[PDB]
Scaffold this active site. Structure first.
Site, PDB file in Angstrom:
ATOM      1  N   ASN B   8      22.566  24.980 -24.951  1.00 34.33           N
ATOM      2  CA  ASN B   8      22.410  25.662 -26.295  1.00 34.33           C
ATOM      3  C   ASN B   8      23.660  25.336 -27.215  1.00 34.33           C
ATOM      4  O   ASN B   8      24.796  25.545 -26.856  1.00 34.33           O
ATOM      5  CB  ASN B   8      22.477  27.206 -25.941  1.00 34.33           C
ATOM      6  CG  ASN B   8      22.128  28.245 -26.837  1.00 34.33           C
ATOM      7  OD1 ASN B   8      21.831  29.191 -26.636  1.00 34.33           O
ATOM      8  ND2 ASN B   8      22.022  27.585 -28.130  1.00 34.33           N
ATOM      9  N   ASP B  64      29.394  31.299 -17.515  1.00 38.55           N
ATOM     10  CA  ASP B  64      28.217  31.688 -16.684  1.00 38.55           C
ATOM     11  C   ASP B  64      28.251  33.416 -16.896  1.00 38.55           C
ATOM     12  O   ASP B  64      29.190  34.109 -16.669  1.00 38.55           O
ATOM     13  CB  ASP B  64      28.452  31.594 -15.311  1.00 38.55           C
ATOM     14  CG  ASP B  64      26.980  31.599 -14.457  1.00 38.55           C
ATOM     15  OD1 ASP B  64      26.771  31.663 -13.345  1.00 38.55           O
ATOM     16  OD2 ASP B  64      25.929  31.617 -15.331  1.00 38.55           O
TER      17      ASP B  64
END
Ligand SMILES: Nc1ncnc2c1ncn2[C@@H]1O[C@H](COP(=O)(O)OP(=O)(O)NP(=O)(O)O)[C@@H](O)[C@H]1O
Lengths: 184, 184
Positions: B8, B64
Protein backbone atom coordinates in the site's frame (compact mmCIF):
# COMPACT_ATOMS: atom_id res chain seq x y z
CA UNK A 1 13.66 -43.80 8.10
CA UNK A 2 11.77 -40.53 7.64
CA UNK A 3 11.57 -37.69 10.17
CA UNK A 4 8.34 -36.04 11.37
CA UNK A 5 8.84 -32.49 12.74
CA UNK A 6 6.17 -32.27 15.43
CA UNK A 7 5.63 -32.18 19.17
CA UNK A 8 2.78 -34.66 19.13
CA UNK A 9 4.18 -38.21 19.47
CA UNK A 10 0.76 -39.62 18.54
CA UNK A 11 1.17 -38.39 14.96
CA UNK A 12 4.20 -40.65 14.57
CA UNK A 13 2.42 -43.61 16.07
CA UNK A 14 -0.49 -42.91 13.75
CA UNK A 15 1.80 -42.49 10.72
CA UNK A 16 3.63 -45.74 11.51
CA UNK A 17 0.43 -47.75 11.65
CA UNK A 18 -0.85 -46.57 8.27
CA UNK A 19 2.60 -47.41 6.91
CA UNK A 20 3.42 -50.57 8.91
CA UNK A 21 3.16 -52.42 5.62
CA UNK A 22 6.23 -50.72 4.11
CA UNK A 23 8.63 -53.19 5.72
CA UNK A 24 11.59 -51.02 4.82
CA UNK A 25 10.18 -47.65 5.98
CA UNK A 26 10.08 -46.20 9.48
CA UNK A 27 8.78 -42.85 10.76
CA UNK A 28 10.68 -41.07 13.49
CA UNK A 29 9.81 -37.93 15.39
CA UNK A 30 12.30 -35.09 15.17
CA UNK A 31 11.82 -32.27 17.66
CA UNK A 32 12.53 -29.40 15.29
CA UNK A 33 10.14 -26.43 15.40
CA UNK A 34 9.34 -24.41 12.28
CA UNK A 35 7.21 -21.37 11.61
CA UNK A 36 3.68 -22.10 10.58
CA UNK A 37 2.95 -19.38 8.08
CA UNK A 38 -0.30 -17.72 7.19
CA UNK A 39 -1.67 -19.12 3.92
CA UNK A 40 -3.17 -22.40 2.69
CA UNK A 41 -2.42 -25.69 4.40
CA UNK A 42 -0.26 -26.40 1.31
CA UNK A 43 1.81 -23.22 1.85
CA UNK A 44 2.13 -23.96 5.56
CA UNK A 45 3.37 -27.51 4.92
CA UNK A 46 5.67 -26.70 2.05
CA UNK A 47 7.33 -23.87 4.01
CA UNK A 48 7.39 -26.05 7.07
CA UNK A 49 9.01 -29.06 5.37
CA UNK A 50 11.66 -26.90 3.63
CA UNK A 51 12.45 -25.12 6.91
CA UNK A 52 13.11 -28.37 8.77
CA UNK A 53 14.92 -29.92 5.82
CA UNK A 54 17.28 -26.96 5.64
CA UNK A 55 18.12 -27.75 9.25
CA UNK A 56 18.13 -31.57 9.35
CA UNK A 57 19.09 -32.26 5.72
CA UNK A 58 17.61 -35.79 6.03
CA UNK A 59 14.22 -37.01 4.66
CA UNK A 60 11.42 -35.32 6.59
CA UNK A 61 7.66 -34.65 6.78
CA UNK A 62 5.49 -31.98 8.36
CA UNK A 63 1.72 -31.74 8.40
CA UNK A 64 -1.03 -29.11 8.77
CA UNK A 65 -4.72 -29.83 9.08
CA UNK A 66 -7.94 -27.87 9.10
CA UNK A 67 -11.75 -27.64 9.25
CA UNK A 68 -13.58 -25.78 6.49
CA UNK A 69 -17.16 -24.58 6.63
CA UNK A 70 -18.75 -23.67 3.32
CA UNK A 71 -21.25 -21.02 4.30
CA UNK A 72 -18.32 -19.49 6.16
CA UNK A 73 -16.19 -19.31 3.00
CA UNK A 74 -13.74 -21.99 4.14
CA UNK A 75 -13.24 -20.43 7.58
CA UNK A 76 -11.63 -21.33 10.05
CA UNK A 77 -9.38 -23.25 7.66
CA UNK A 78 -5.69 -23.06 8.45
CA UNK A 79 -6.42 -21.09 11.69
CA UNK A 80 -8.84 -23.74 12.87
CA UNK A 81 -7.00 -24.21 16.20
CA UNK A 82 -6.91 -20.48 17.07
CA UNK A 83 -10.59 -20.27 16.26
CA UNK A 84 -11.34 -23.38 18.37
CA UNK A 85 -9.62 -21.75 21.33
CA UNK A 86 -11.23 -18.32 21.01
CA UNK A 87 -14.76 -18.98 19.76
CA UNK A 88 -14.86 -22.76 19.75
CA UNK A 89 -17.61 -24.99 18.44
CA UNK A 90 -20.29 -22.71 19.92
CA UNK A 91 -18.85 -19.93 17.81
CA UNK A 92 -19.13 -22.09 14.74
CA UNK A 93 -22.83 -22.97 15.46
CA UNK A 94 -23.71 -19.35 16.22
CA UNK A 95 -22.26 -18.37 12.83
CA UNK A 96 -24.13 -21.19 11.04
CA UNK A 97 -27.42 -20.17 12.61
CA UNK A 98 -30.03 -19.90 9.88
CA UNK A 99 -27.67 -21.22 7.19
CA UNK A 100 -29.11 -23.86 4.89
CA UNK A 101 -25.69 -24.90 3.64
CA UNK A 102 -24.13 -26.70 6.64
CA UNK A 103 -21.53 -28.37 4.43
CA UNK A 104 -17.92 -28.52 5.61
CA UNK A 105 -14.82 -30.69 5.37
CA UNK A 106 -11.56 -31.59 7.16
CA UNK A 107 -8.30 -31.73 5.16
CA UNK A 108 -4.73 -32.69 5.93
CA UNK A 109 -1.69 -31.81 3.83
CA UNK A 110 1.53 -33.66 4.49
CA UNK A 111 4.69 -31.90 3.45
CA UNK A 112 7.56 -34.12 2.39
CA UNK A 113 11.09 -32.88 1.56
CA UNK A 114 14.53 -34.31 0.82
CA UNK A 115 17.54 -33.54 -1.38
CA UNK A 116 15.12 -33.68 -4.32
CA UNK A 117 12.66 -31.13 -2.94
CA UNK A 118 9.18 -30.78 -1.44
CA UNK A 119 6.18 -32.95 -2.29
CA UNK A 120 2.59 -32.39 -1.06
CA UNK A 121 0.12 -35.20 -0.19
CA UNK A 122 -3.52 -34.53 0.60
CA UNK A 123 -6.62 -36.06 2.11
CA UNK A 124 -10.11 -34.73 2.66
CA UNK A 125 -13.33 -35.89 4.19
CA UNK A 126 -16.52 -34.10 3.19
CA UNK A 127 -19.50 -33.92 5.45
CA UNK A 128 -21.80 -31.45 7.16
CA UNK A 129 -21.99 -29.52 10.42
CA UNK A 130 -24.58 -30.67 12.92
CA UNK A 131 -27.02 -28.31 14.58
CA UNK A 132 -25.88 -29.24 18.05
CA UNK A 133 -22.88 -30.70 19.88
CA UNK A 134 -23.22 -34.49 19.74
CA UNK A 135 -20.52 -36.45 21.59
CA UNK A 136 -19.73 -39.89 23.03
CA UNK A 137 -16.40 -38.60 24.32
CA UNK A 138 -14.47 -39.67 21.23
CA UNK A 139 -12.82 -36.74 19.54
CA UNK A 140 -11.15 -33.35 19.68
CA UNK A 141 -12.58 -29.89 19.11
CA UNK A 142 -14.77 -29.77 15.97
CA UNK A 143 -15.40 -33.49 16.02
CA UNK A 144 -18.52 -32.97 18.16
CA UNK A 145 -20.10 -31.00 15.28
CA UNK A 146 -18.85 -32.69 12.09
CA UNK A 147 -20.84 -35.43 10.42
CA UNK A 148 -18.78 -37.29 7.81
CA UNK A 149 -20.18 -38.13 4.39
CA UNK A 150 -23.19 -40.47 4.60
CA UNK A 151 -23.07 -40.93 8.38
CA UNK A 152 -25.69 -39.70 10.83
CA UNK A 153 -23.21 -39.57 13.68
CA UNK A 154 -20.56 -36.88 14.20
CA UNK A 155 -16.84 -37.82 14.61
CA UNK A 156 -17.37 -37.41 18.39
CA UNK A 157 -19.73 -40.42 18.48
CA UNK A 158 -17.50 -42.68 16.43
CA UNK A 159 -14.62 -44.79 17.63
CA UNK A 160 -11.07 -44.50 16.29
CA UNK A 161 -11.77 -47.66 14.27
CA UNK A 162 -15.05 -46.31 12.83
CA UNK A 163 -13.13 -43.30 11.48
CA UNK A 164 -9.92 -45.06 10.50
CA UNK A 165 -10.65 -45.45 6.81
CA UNK A 166 -12.63 -42.31 6.16
CA UNK A 167 -10.50 -39.61 7.79
CA UNK A 168 -8.57 -36.89 5.95
CA UNK A 169 -5.47 -37.86 7.88
CA UNK A 170 -5.86 -41.44 6.88
CA UNK A 171 -6.39 -40.40 3.27
CA UNK A 172 -3.37 -38.09 3.28
CA UNK A 173 -1.09 -40.86 4.61
CA UNK A 174 -2.32 -43.34 1.98
CA UNK A 175 -1.27 -40.78 -0.65
CA UNK A 176 2.18 -40.39 0.95
CA UNK A 177 2.30 -44.21 1.02
CA UNK A 178 1.48 -44.50 -2.72
CA UNK A 179 4.41 -42.12 -3.24
CA UNK A 180 6.74 -44.25 -1.04
CA UNK A 181 5.59 -47.50 -2.69
CA UNK A 182 5.73 -46.75 -6.40
CA UNK A 183 8.84 -44.70 -5.53
CA UNK A 184 12.13 -45.20 -7.35
CA UNK B 1 16.21 6.63 4.08
CA UNK B 2 14.21 3.85 5.76
CA UNK B 3 12.23 1.44 3.63
CA UNK B 4 8.71 0.27 4.28
CA UNK B 5 8.20 -3.29 2.98
CA UNK B 6 4.57 -2.72 1.97
CA UNK B 7 2.24 -2.88 -1.03
CA UNK B 8 0.00 0.00 0.00
CA UNK B 9 1.61 3.32 -0.99
CA UNK B 10 -0.79 5.35 1.15
CA UNK B 11 0.90 3.60 4.05
CA UNK B 12 4.23 5.23 3.17
CA UNK B 13 2.26 8.45 2.61
CA UNK B 14 0.69 8.15 6.07
CA UNK B 15 4.09 7.31 7.60
CA UNK B 16 5.99 10.21 5.99
CA UNK B 17 3.34 12.63 7.27
CA UNK B 18 3.99 11.67 10.88
CA UNK B 19 7.71 11.82 9.96
CA UNK B 20 7.18 15.44 8.86
CA UNK B 21 9.56 17.17 11.32
CA UNK B 22 12.45 14.71 11.40
CA UNK B 23 15.32 15.50 9.03
CA UNK B 24 15.46 11.85 7.93
CA UNK B 25 11.77 12.08 6.98
CA UNK B 26 12.53 9.73 4.12
CA UNK B 27 10.42 6.58 4.37
CA UNK B 28 10.67 4.66 1.11
CA UNK B 29 8.21 2.01 -0.07
CA UNK B 30 9.86 -1.17 -1.27
CA UNK B 31 8.08 -4.16 -2.85
CA UNK B 32 9.63 -6.92 -0.82
CA UNK B 33 7.27 -9.61 0.40
CA UNK B 34 7.72 -11.57 3.60
CA UNK B 35 5.97 -14.55 5.26
CA UNK B 36 3.42 -13.49 7.85
CA UNK B 37 3.81 -16.24 10.43
CA UNK B 38 1.03 -17.34 12.75
CA UNK B 39 1.79 -15.85 16.14
CA UNK B 40 1.29 -12.57 17.92
CA UNK B 41 1.32 -9.31 16.00
CA UNK B 42 4.76 -8.75 17.52
CA UNK B 43 5.88 -12.14 16.26
CA UNK B 44 4.74 -11.40 12.69
CA UNK B 45 6.40 -7.97 12.72
CA UNK B 46 9.69 -9.26 14.09
CA UNK B 47 9.86 -12.18 11.71
CA UNK B 48 8.79 -9.99 8.82
CA UNK B 49 11.31 -7.25 9.66
CA UNK B 50 14.37 -9.46 9.84
CA UNK B 51 13.21 -11.40 6.79
CA UNK B 52 13.14 -8.47 4.39
CA UNK B 53 16.26 -7.04 6.04
CA UNK B 54 18.31 -10.17 5.33
CA UNK B 55 17.15 -9.69 1.72
CA UNK B 56 17.62 -5.89 1.37
CA UNK B 57 20.46 -5.49 3.92
CA UNK B 58 19.33 -1.93 4.60
CA UNK B 59 17.16 -0.32 7.32
CA UNK B 60 13.52 -1.34 6.89
CA UNK B 61 10.12 -1.38 8.63
CA UNK B 62 7.15 -3.75 8.30
CA UNK B 63 3.81 -3.27 10.01
CA UNK B 64 1.03 -5.59 11.20
CA UNK B 65 -2.29 -4.66 12.68
CA UNK B 66 -5.25 -6.51 14.13
CA UNK B 67 -8.71 -6.06 15.61
CA UNK B 68 -9.12 -7.81 18.94
CA UNK B 69 -12.50 -8.26 20.58
CA UNK B 70 -12.80 -9.05 24.26
CA UNK B 71 -15.86 -11.25 24.44
CA UNK B 72 -14.38 -13.32 21.62
CA UNK B 73 -11.10 -13.79 23.40
CA UNK B 74 -8.84 -11.73 21.18
CA UNK B 75 -10.18 -13.13 17.90
CA UNK B 76 -9.71 -12.14 14.98
CA UNK B 77 -6.46 -10.75 16.25
CA UNK B 78 -3.63 -11.29 13.87
CA UNK B 79 -6.04 -13.08 11.47
CA UNK B 80 -8.29 -10.07 11.06
CA UNK B 81 -8.05 -9.90 7.29
CA UNK B 82 -8.89 -13.57 6.78
CA UNK B 83 -11.77 -13.22 9.16
CA UNK B 84 -12.86 -10.00 7.44
CA UNK B 85 -12.83 -11.69 4.05
CA UNK B 86 -14.64 -14.93 5.12
CA UNK B 87 -17.30 -13.99 7.69
CA UNK B 88 -16.93 -10.17 7.68
CA UNK B 89 -18.30 -7.59 10.11
CA UNK B 90 -21.53 -9.49 9.88
CA UNK B 91 -19.75 -12.45 11.40
CA UNK B 92 -18.43 -10.69 14.49
CA UNK B 93 -21.78 -8.99 15.14
CA UNK B 94 -23.54 -12.40 15.09
CA UNK B 95 -20.87 -13.86 17.36
CA UNK B 96 -21.54 -10.90 19.68
CA UNK B 97 -25.37 -11.10 19.71
CA UNK B 98 -26.66 -11.22 23.29
CA UNK B 99 -23.19 -10.44 24.70
CA UNK B 100 -23.00 -7.30 26.82
CA UNK B 101 -19.23 -6.96 26.87
CA UNK B 102 -18.75 -5.30 23.49
CA UNK B 103 -15.25 -4.17 24.39
CA UNK B 104 -12.55 -4.27 21.70
CA UNK B 105 -9.40 -2.59 20.44
CA UNK B 106 -7.22 -2.12 17.35
CA UNK B 107 -3.46 -2.74 17.55
CA UNK B 108 -0.46 -2.05 15.36
CA UNK B 109 3.14 -3.23 15.64
CA UNK B 110 5.83 -1.68 13.44
CA UNK B 111 8.76 -4.03 13.11
CA UNK B 112 12.03 -2.21 12.56
CA UNK B 113 15.18 -4.07 11.63
CA UNK B 114 18.78 -2.94 11.30
CA UNK B 115 22.19 -4.40 10.79
CA UNK B 116 21.77 -4.29 14.59
CA UNK B 117 18.56 -6.28 15.03
CA UNK B 118 14.83 -5.79 15.61
CA UNK B 119 12.89 -3.10 17.52
CA UNK B 120 9.07 -3.15 17.76
CA UNK B 121 6.83 -0.06 18.12
CA UNK B 122 3.19 -0.34 19.12
CA UNK B 123 0.01 1.69 18.96
CA UNK B 124 -3.40 0.85 20.36
CA UNK B 125 -6.87 2.36 20.38
CA UNK B 126 -9.29 0.74 22.81
CA UNK B 127 -13.02 0.99 22.30
CA UNK B 128 -16.15 -1.03 21.76
CA UNK B 129 -18.03 -2.89 19.07
CA UNK B 130 -21.04 -1.26 17.44
CA UNK B 131 -24.41 -3.02 17.69
CA UNK B 132 -24.69 -2.66 13.90
CA UNK B 133 -22.72 -1.48 10.85
CA UNK B 134 -22.40 2.30 10.56
CA UNK B 135 -20.49 4.11 7.82
CA UNK B 136 -20.14 7.50 6.14
CA UNK B 137 -17.59 5.98 3.80
CA UNK B 138 -14.31 6.27 5.72
CA UNK B 139 -12.01 3.48 6.78
CA UNK B 140 -12.20 -0.17 5.85
CA UNK B 141 -12.88 -3.68 7.17
CA UNK B 142 -13.95 -3.37 10.82
CA UNK B 143 -13.94 0.41 10.90
CA UNK B 144 -17.71 0.48 10.65
CA UNK B 145 -18.34 -1.52 13.82
CA UNK B 146 -15.65 -0.03 16.03
CA UNK B 147 -16.45 3.07 18.13
CA UNK B 148 -13.08 4.41 19.37
CA UNK B 149 -12.28 5.75 22.83
CA UNK B 150 -15.17 7.97 23.98
CA UNK B 151 -17.05 8.77 20.76
CA UNK B 152 -20.51 7.89 19.55
CA UNK B 153 -19.47 7.35 15.93
CA UNK B 154 -17.57 4.42 14.47
CA UNK B 155 -14.24 4.82 12.68
CA UNK B 156 -16.12 4.67 9.35
CA UNK B 157 -18.22 7.71 10.32
CA UNK B 158 -15.12 9.80 11.20
CA UNK B 159 -12.79 11.59 8.78
CA UNK B 160 -9.14 10.67 8.52
CA UNK B 161 -8.41 13.91 10.33
CA UNK B 162 -11.04 13.34 13.02
CA UNK B 163 -9.28 10.18 14.16
CA UNK B 164 -5.94 12.02 14.03
CA UNK B 165 -5.57 11.23 17.74
CA UNK B 166 -7.51 7.95 18.01
CA UNK B 167 -5.32 6.09 15.52
CA UNK B 168 -3.43 2.99 16.53
CA UNK B 169 -1.53 3.32 13.25
CA UNK B 170 -0.14 6.79 14.03
CA UNK B 171 0.39 6.00 17.75
CA UNK B 172 2.65 3.13 16.67
CA UNK B 173 4.40 5.49 14.29
CA UNK B 174 4.78 8.39 16.78
CA UNK B 175 6.54 5.79 18.92
CA UNK B 176 8.88 5.03 16.00
CA UNK B 177 9.51 8.79 15.49
CA UNK B 178 10.80 9.15 19.05
CA UNK B 179 13.33 6.34 18.38
CA UNK B 180 14.56 8.16 15.28
CA UNK B 181 14.61 11.50 17.10
CA UNK B 182 17.23 9.90 19.37
CA UNK B 183 19.59 8.79 16.60
CA UNK B 184 21.69 11.43 14.85
N1 LIG C 1 -4.37 -38.08 23.11
C1 LIG C 1 -3.89 -37.36 22.12
N2 LIG C 1 -3.20 -36.20 22.39
C2 LIG C 1 -2.72 -35.47 21.36
N3 LIG C 1 -2.81 -35.73 20.03
C3 LIG C 1 -3.52 -36.91 19.78
C4 LIG C 1 -4.07 -37.76 20.73
N4 LIG C 1 -4.71 -38.84 20.13
C5 LIG C 1 -4.52 -38.62 18.85
N5 LIG C 1 -3.80 -37.47 18.56
C6 LIG C 1 -3.37 -36.89 17.22
O1 LIG C 1 -4.10 -35.71 16.81
C7 LIG C 1 -4.59 -35.84 15.45
C8 LIG C 1 -6.04 -35.50 15.24
O2 LIG C 1 -6.42 -34.17 15.69
P1 LIG C 1 -7.91 -33.61 15.48
O3 LIG C 1 -8.02 -32.25 16.10
O4 LIG C 1 -8.92 -34.64 15.80
O5 LIG C 1 -7.80 -33.42 13.87
P2 LIG C 1 -6.98 -32.57 12.78
O6 LIG C 1 -7.72 -32.59 11.48
O7 LIG C 1 -5.56 -33.02 12.80
N6 LIG C 1 -7.07 -31.02 13.41
P3 LIG C 1 -8.15 -29.81 13.11
O8 LIG C 1 -8.22 -29.72 11.62
O9 LIG C 1 -7.66 -28.56 13.78
O10 LIG C 1 -9.44 -30.30 13.69
C9 LIG C 1 -4.19 -37.23 14.97
O11 LIG C 1 -3.39 -37.04 13.82
C10 LIG C 1 -3.43 -37.87 16.08
O12 LIG C 1 -2.08 -38.20 15.73
Amino acid sequence: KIYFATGNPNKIKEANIILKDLKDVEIEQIKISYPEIQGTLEEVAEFGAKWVYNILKKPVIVEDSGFFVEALNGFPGTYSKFVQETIGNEGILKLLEGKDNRNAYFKTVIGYCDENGVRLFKGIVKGRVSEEIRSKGYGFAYDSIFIPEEEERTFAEMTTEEKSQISHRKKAFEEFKKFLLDRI
